[PDB]
Amino acid sequence: MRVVIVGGGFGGIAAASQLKSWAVPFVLVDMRDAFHHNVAALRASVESGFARKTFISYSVTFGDSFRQGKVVGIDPERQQVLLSDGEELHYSHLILATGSDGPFPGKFNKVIDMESAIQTYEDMVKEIEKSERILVVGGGAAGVEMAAEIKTEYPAKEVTLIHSKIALADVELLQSVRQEVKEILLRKGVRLLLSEKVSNVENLTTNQFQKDMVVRTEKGTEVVVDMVVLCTGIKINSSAYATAFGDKLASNGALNVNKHLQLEGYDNIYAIGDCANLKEPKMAYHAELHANIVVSNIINSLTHKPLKTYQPGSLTFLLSMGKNDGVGQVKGYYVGHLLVTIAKSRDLFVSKSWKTMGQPMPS
Amino acid sequence: MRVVIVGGGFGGIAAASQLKSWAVPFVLVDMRDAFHHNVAALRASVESGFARKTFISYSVTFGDSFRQGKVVGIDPERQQVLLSDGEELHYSHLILATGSDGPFPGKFNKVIDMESAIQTYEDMVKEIEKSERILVVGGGAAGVEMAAEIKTEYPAKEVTLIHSKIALADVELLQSVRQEVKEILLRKGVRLLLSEKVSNVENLTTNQFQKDMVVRTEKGTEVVVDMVVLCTGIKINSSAYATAFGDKLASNGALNVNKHLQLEGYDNIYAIGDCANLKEPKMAYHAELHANIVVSNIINSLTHKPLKTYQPGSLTFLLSMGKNDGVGQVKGYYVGHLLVTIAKSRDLFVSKSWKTMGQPMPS
Ligand SMILES: Cc1cc2nc3c(=O)[nH]c(=O)nc-3n(C[C@H](O)[C@H](O)[C@H](O)COP(=O)(O)OP(=O)(O)OC[C@H]3O[C@@H](n4cnc5c(N)ncnc54)[C@H](O)[C@@H]3O)c2cc1C
Ligand SMILES: Cc1cc2nc3c(=O)[nH]c(=O)nc-3n(C[C@H](O)[C@H](O)[C@H](O)COP(=O)(O)OP(=O)(O)OC[C@H]3O[C@@H](n4cnc5c(N)ncnc54)[C@H](O)[C@@H]3O)c2cc1C
Ligand SMILES: COC1=C(OC)C(=O)C(CC=C(C)C)=C(C)C1=O
Ligand SMILES: COC1=C(OC)C(=O)C(CC=C(C)C)=C(C)C1=O
């Protein structure tokens, strides 16, 4: 038997670790040969020597249970995974954990070797460093995070964020959280340009230092900057499975799953992470929880025992520390519960990834 | 000098305590002669002997610095507070903390003495007890909380909730929190009736046991129950100040305040709590924070020192205990922060009120 995991992100490495613990034969497949803590990618492109902490070699940990490859198709009837080099992997169980894609520097999903990947980000740090005037296109989570990490490292640099809606960030965040985001950006000195779209986006020289660039909006507004960073429009990454399930995807590219995280019409295909069409925020935190359920259900498949049901409201959360970071803000109430915000760890959880992967964090 | 506080709720008693600590002369004015932990009112009307924990005598604590009265007008030019018994109180500083009003059992803002108030709720417990079939009108926070406290105490009772929108609870809650509310109600056995409004609401016999009552909606739908509980439409309570500031209120009845919580055109009137028009969730937790700022600024008024600014994002929150209740759910992320839900204390924070008021909780 063989569990093939397509996608070695937060979901895929959590499921690969467990399958290794359970001694279940598997192959993890990913475009890169290293994992990318994508949550800390924006910092990786601003702070020197930091991208080295955001990429972990797959083969040091998983050995020959890893195969670098770009999946271009899935044959669910013959149970084959089709790579772009013409090769095929047979599976008994398929876990799809393809996550989300979008422009560099926020996402980095391409065929590339760990050293070039790190050096792609270290080149970006130095082009940021050269630029006194930076435009960041797009005001979602990637754009906001990019803006704030520039003024963090370079408080005197002029950063500008342009966004096509009325408020920053994601509609499914509280209008008072979006507004809080607007105000954390203003406190840092980031100048905003809301409700207007860049025109001729395609013609911009991006990720490079270029003195006196002129960006025109659709409103005719003009700003002059020394560098454009593109943070427009992160989508679910359906490239690996669109040909197989295209008719049947959700509107946003995600896969429909039953309560055991199996694909609607298949007992031996599962989806986890961003690519699963679940009514819940697409986070790395949940992808690990999805992984836990899907490996459970592969084992129960083997032992002809009842499948476990992914309970979205899993209470697997405790303040990371013991009064070392107690303070929290209150943001709402409803029956039995209180909406609260807490601060993200300052290392952006990188230490966890190195632990999951069983490698010393480099220095 | 005299600080007159109109409204002795969470805001008003927090500001009265502090003014007593600061030895600043004040008069607290409230309709009732007891404070009402309104957050635990719905439980008070379901669980026997519990309403006695939700009302605290004002005069045991504040003495003659308390005056029972219903304020019917404010003269901000002569600095007079006008009571319904014809009497007038002069002030040097006015704190308006009038909160929110709406139907019993959720709110209880009327001229009444502590013992009748408790006995009004203990009568409701017994009418709930008599009823096998309960309709709760309205699916906001009061309706949802009422539904869930009935099935809590009486798991076999049939409770029905009817609401006029598409999802339970408040639009400014996350669509996945509203949906979580929908599902906490379904897990308890509460039958929902969404997107339809009761017709002829006025003709219903409410808060009383009446076998075989027939409620018709505007859709023509019919349900037969033994009791109607009304939880429709909590508004800001502008009764004390509408005549003075009517032209100038916000759309929802709240008072516009500067960053020091003073009313727009007055240096000696402040608003705190629900009645302040601040971009933040109307909670008891924030009203105490508003109180802290407004008493600070009355002192700074006395010492000709700079006014403090109410920072909405005040980080005055630490998990109530030390690992005694660590687990929390994750519900989102944005720059620097994580949306999390935590469980409300099971006593609904009643102990705090008795502490603030310096009285032994009765038993
Ligand atoms: C700015 C920002 C900040 C964030 N912060 C947080 C945070 O603090 N906490 C949090 O929990 N979440 C956070 N997130 C969300 C988080 O990054 C994602 O939800 C998470 O990465 C989902 O993991 P995954 O396993 O589903 O997929 P991913 O981690 O996106 O991994 C998918 C993998 O699949 C591979 N792949 C895809 N298609 C193919 C193919 N055809 N062939 C081969 N390989 C393929 C890709 O190369 C990639 O390695 C943030 C997101 C952004 C943009
Ligand atoms: C079901 C439900 C659950 C809730 N749960 C929570 C929770 O867990 N946590 C939380 O923080 N918040 C919670 N809230 C919100 C909370 O109850 C209110 O935000 C809070 O009471 C606001 O306090 P306040 O001081 O502004 O006014 P209130 O506590 O409403 O007090 C106002 C007072 O003013 C008096 N008054 C008004 N007009 C006059 C007048 N003209 N003359 C004399 N006296 C007058 C009234 O008698 C009343 O005593 C909940 C609300 C509901 C409905
Ligand atoms: C970066 O991905 C993430 C994790 O895995 C490394 C987490 O464990 C967690 C959970 C951490 C707790 C303390 C909330 C979060 C929130 C997360 O975003
Ligand atoms: C009932 O009113 C309330 C308070 O005062 C009694 C609080 O202190 C608090 C704060 C409690 C912490 C632990 C979140 C909340 C949430 C509240 O709702």
Numbering used by the authors:
A (entry chain A), B (entry chain A): 11 to 373
Reproduce text from the manuscript describing this model.
Ferroptosis suppressor protein 1 (FSP1, also known as AIMF2, AMID or PRG3) is a recently identified glutathione-independent ferroptosis suppressor, but its underlying structural mechanism remains unknown. FSP1 is recently identified as a breakthrough owing to its unique ability to suppress ferroptosis by reducing ubiquinone to ubiquinol, or vitamin K to reduced hydroquinone (VKH2). The overall structure of cFSP1ΔN adopts a glutathione reductase-like fold and is also composed of three domains, a FAD-binding domain (FBD, residues 12–141, and 241–318) harboring a FAD molecule, a NAD(P)H-binding domain (NBD, residues 142–240) and a C-terminal domain (CTD, residues 319–373). Our work reveals that the homodimer of FSP1 is required for the formation of FAD- and ubiquinone-binding pockets, as well as the activity of NAD(P)H: ubiquinone oxidoreduction and ferroptosis suppression.
We report the crystal structures of cFSP1 (residues 12–373, hereafter named cFSP1ΔN) in its substrate-free and ubiquinone (CoQ1)-bound forms at 2.0 and 2.6 Å resolution, respectively. The structure of the ubiquinone-bound form was obtained by co-crystallizing cFSP1ΔN with ubiquinone Q1 (CoQ1) in the absence of NAD(P)H. In both substrate-free and CoQ1-bound structures, each asymmetric unit contains one cFSP1ΔN molecule, and their structures are virtually identical (r.m.s. deviation of ~0.4 Å), with the exception of a loop 327–337 at CTD, which assumes two different conformations even though it is partially disordered and displays weak density, suggesting a role in regulating substrate access to the active site. The peteridine moiety of the isoalloxazine ring is located in a canonical active site for ubiquinone substrate binding (hereafter named ubiquinone-binding pocket), which is mainly formed by residues 293–298 of α10, residues 327–331 and 354–362 from CTD, residues 340–350 from CTD of the other chain in the dimer, where one CoQ1 molecule is clearly buried in. The CoQ1 interacts with cFSP1 by mainly hydrophobic interactions with residues forming the ubiquinone-binding pocket, including Ala294, Tyr295, residues 327–329, Phe359, Lys362 and two residues (Val340 and Leu348) from the other chain of the dimer. Moreover, the head group of CoQ1 interacts with the FAD through a hydrogen bond between the O4 atom of CoQ1 and N3 atoms of FAD. The mutation of Leu329 (Leu330 in hFSP1), which is positioned at the entrance loop for the substrate CoQ1, probably reduces the binding activity to CoQ. Notably, in these two structures, cFSP1ΔN molecule forms a dimer with its crystallographic symmetric molecule. The interactions between the two cFSP1 monomers are mainly mediated through its CTD.
